[PDB]
Design a protein around this ligand. Structure first.
Ligand SMILES: *[C@@H]1O[C@H](CO)[C@@H](O[C@@H]2O[C@H](CO)[C@@H](O[C@@H]3O[C@H](CO)[C@@H](O)[C@H](O)[C@@H]3O)[C@H](O)[C@H]2NC(C)=O)[C@H](O)[C@H]1NC(C)=O
Ligand SMILES: *[C@@H]1O[C@H](CO)[C@@H](O[C@@H]2O[C@H](CO)[C@@H](O[C@@H]3O[C@H](CO)[C@@H](O)[C@H](O)[C@@H]3O)[C@H](O)[C@H]2NC(C)=O)[C@H](O)[C@H]1NC(C)=O
Ligand SMILES: *[C@@H]1O[C@H](CO)[C@@H](O[C@@H]2O[C@H](CO)[C@@H](O)[C@H](O)[C@H]2NC(C)=O)[C@H](O)[C@H]1NC(C)=O
Ligand SMILES: *[C@@H]1O[C@H](CO)[C@@H](O)[C@H](O)[C@H]1NC(C)=O
Ligand SMILES: *[C@@H]1O[C@H](CO)[C@@H](O)[C@H](O)[C@H]1NC(C)=O
Lengths: 99, 49, 56, 49
């Protein structure tokens, strides 16, 4: 078990304070040099209705926003059955990923 | 976090520009219950305050 | 004609459009230059070939 | 301060639509960037325009 280098899959720790939150906001620092363009890769993950409540604290869909220098985008998750898996590594999973 | 920075360069593009008169909407009567209108120092006016 | 920045451009937002602007500028300058060069070349040809009438 | 001013702690969300052009925004609650290009007085809040 691994993942994309490009991003980290934030699963909230263990039972604890695991629950649904209102949108959290995050700044993405510049990190590159000089006159370089910095391309940031990010996304999200959904699952079975029961798996969702197992993983995170929440059954309902979750919502996402990216803003970088004038360009705004908005996304909202799918809960129930997704498209048949494709171009993937080959193991069956109940969830999918948007990037 | 918005395109706001270019607003002057946009205005610039036109031959004729002008702030308006009056107001495109009454803030105090707007939907969501009566509003007092907020002000802050760092924004002083002809007087001050 | 003049070739200035287009007014709805916006450097941050629409770069691609902007790149195409650049393209159209460069292409213009090139073409018009060629045309001029031609006009001159022709003109010089005339000036030098004309140099035989006094004889007549 | 959010609960003092308005009735609400959680983030608030916004939308503009003018002739084909749609935009969407959502607020930040906790600590913001250090103030900049401002009038000089320290405030806990910030503004999106
Ligand atoms: C997606 O959600 C479904 C339920 O909607 C989950 O189904 C569970 O799938 C596993 C694998 O097919 C089943 O486990 C197997 O069950 C049998 C009998 O209990 C046991 O003999 C095996 O050792 C194994 O555990 C499980 O029973 C099934 N659950 C139900 C309700 O049918 C699936 O796990 C979910 N995926 C994600 C990633 O959470
Ligand atoms: C932003 O929220 C913070 C709390 O998270 C607010 O902090 C409050 O800041 C003021 C100014 O530093 C403190 O007031 C001073 O307190 C001392 C002692 O009570 C008093 O001697 C002074 O006369 C003065 O009132 C206040 O105590 C502090 N609150 C806490 C919880 O530490 C700040 O006001 C917030 N800003 C906005 C715009 O609401
Ligand atoms: C400049 O600022 C002052 C306050 O710093 C404004 O005075 C306020 O006026 C409103 C009504 O217009 C009153 O409700 C407030 O009580 C006034 N504040 C104080 C403390 O006097 C003033 O109106 C501003 N000047 C202009 C013309 O905008
Ligand atoms: C997904 O797989 C099932 C078999 O497990 C198949 O019946 C179904 O047609 C597939 N759906 C797609 C999108 O091809
Ligand atoms: C903001 O100000 C504090 C000092 O009050 C300083 O320590 C911190 O580095 C500043 N942050 C930024 C973004 O410069």
């Amino acid at each position: 078990n691994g993942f994309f280098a490009t991003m980290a899959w934030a699963v909230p720790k263990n039972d604890k304070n695991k629950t649904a939150t209102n949108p959290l906001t995050i700044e993405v620092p510049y990190i590159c040099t000089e006159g370089e363009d910095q391309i940031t890769v990010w996304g999200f993950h959904s699952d079975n209705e029961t798996q969702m409540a197992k993983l995170y604290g929440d059954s309902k869909p979750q919502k996402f926003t990216s803003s970088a220098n004038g360009v705004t985008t908005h996304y909202v998750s799918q809960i129930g059955g997704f498209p048949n898996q494709t171009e993937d590594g080959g193991l069956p999973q109940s969830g999918r990923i948007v990037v | 976090r918005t395109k706001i920075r270019q607003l002057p360069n946009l205005l610039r593009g036109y031959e004729h520009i002008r702030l308006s008169t009056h107001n495109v909407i009454n803030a105090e009567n707007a939907p969501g219950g009566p509003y007092k209108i907020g002000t802050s120092g760092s924004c002083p006016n002809i007087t001050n305050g | 004609k003049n070739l200035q920045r287009l007014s709805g451009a916006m450097d941050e937002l629409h770069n691609e459009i902007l790149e195409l602007d650049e393209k159209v500028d460069d292409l213009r300058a090139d073409t018009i230059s060629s045309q001029i060069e031609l006009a001159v070349l022709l003109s010089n040809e005339g000036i030098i070939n004309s140099e035989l009438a006094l004889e007549r």
